[PDB]
Copies of this chain bind each other. A is one copy, B any other.
Amino acid sequence: GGNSNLSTATVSGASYAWYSDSSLTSLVSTAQNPMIVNISTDTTWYLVVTVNGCSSVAGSTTVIVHPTPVTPNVPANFAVCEGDNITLSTSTVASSYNWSGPNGFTSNVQNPVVITNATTSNAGVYTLSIIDGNGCESGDTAVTVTVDSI
């Protein structure tokens, strides 16, 4: 889903044409250094440089899409007695963590602040996603937490 720049050599007197595919059937941009926007998979652009009416053989480059990181390791559904604590944690390592849940609960760490004196307003689904070392976000996982009235 990210963007990346392409770049090439400056050729005096040249016009540049970037094509989306083999056989140069569809033009995408005319720039020395165009950007590819919203890349979902490994993709290639082809480049033709034309000087004084003579066109070069298309050059090319591949932008690699970084592999999506693995879904976080989060505990199984648990239950807490009303008045007791809700403890959340994850077993994986991240650049950052993004937790969210009931009552506006949020946290950016591996071991979020414990919710004390749990009441039924803290029951619900606690969701976690992870940002890896290369900056990519993993898919969501979640734990359902119930609170048993006393």
Contacts and interface: CB of A to CB of B under 8 A. Distances in A.
Contacts of A85: 121
Contact of A104 (B103, B112, B116, B121): B112
A104 B113 contact: yes
Contacts of A135: none
- For chain A, the bracket of interface size reads 20 to 34
A112 B101 CA distance: 9
A39 B53 CA distance: 38
A71 B116 CA distance: 35
A134 B114 CA distance: 34
A103 B114 contact: yes
A113 B114 CA distance: 17
A111 B87 contact: no
A39 to B, nearest CB: 15
B110 A103 contact: no
Interface in A90-132: 100-104, 106-107, 109-114, 116, 121, 124
B101 A111 contact: yes
A15 interface: yes
Interface of A: 8-9, 15, 30, 85, 87, 100-104, 106-107, 109-114, 116, 121, 124
13 contacts: A8-B30, A87-B121, A100-B109, A100-B110, A100-B111, A101-B111, A103-B113, A104-B107, A104-B112, A106-B109, A111-B124, A114-B121, A116-B121
